[PDB]
A = this chain, B = another copy of it.
Amino acid sequence: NYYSSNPTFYLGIDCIIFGFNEGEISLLLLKRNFEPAMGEWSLMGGFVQKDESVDDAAKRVLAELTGLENVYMEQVGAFGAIDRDPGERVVSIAYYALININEYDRELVQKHNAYWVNINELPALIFDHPEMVDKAREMMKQKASVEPIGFNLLPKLFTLSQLQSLYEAIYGEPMDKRNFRKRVAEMDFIEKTDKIDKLGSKRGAALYKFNGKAYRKDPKFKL
């Protein structure tokens, strides 16, 4: 009964869920069909529970909405402005997540009333969610340059143009193809399969995969 004299708080959880399609990055967002702030756009969220760690609670939430587990997640931070939720004192912890937009479970998404939304065409979001999104992007952008988290946003196989397209999207500017492909050339953990994609191009481009094993053997990364 040492910590007895201190108050206790609601720990919220909020998820910035990145996805990528057709050269553009989107966030999966809720168009709330429940109170508070019903009708308004927000992040997917929840509340830490007694039997779970904060990190798991995040995983839970993410899975309740997307169906996915074993997802790349990063903690964005604790947000504990006093009036950040008008209703009650909630300190929410925020995580971001990179998922593959093809692989999520639509039933669960439909039911939460959530929609993918281009990240530069974003509605106003409730509470301190825009603050959270901003910090999230900042971080993801940073980490994506020095670690291969990008590949979580693409499927297993992909074309150097899809890749380039993505990296162009994350950073918000185009880049020279010949240079880009050269850097990729020397990253051995980005491996050319003997497969080809026919549906993306007339000539059809060679598909590549990310090789976790090879990466860890020599974790150099630059784009």
Contact = CB atoms under 8 A, between A and B. Distances in A.
A7 interface: yes
A82 interface: yes
A interface, size bucket: 20 to 34
Interface string A52-92: 11110100000000000000000101111110000111110
A40 to B, nearest CB: 15
The copy count of this chain in the complex is 2
B11 A10 contact: no
A66 B217 CA distance: 45
Q: Which 6 A-B pairs have the closest CB atoms?
A: A54-B80, A8-B8, A6-B47, A78-B78, A3-B88, A78-B93
Interface of A: 2-3, 6-11, 34-36, 47-55, 57, 75, 77-82, 87-91, 93
8 contacts: A3-B87, A8-B10, A48-B91, A53-B80, A54-B80, A54-B81, A75-B77, A75-B78
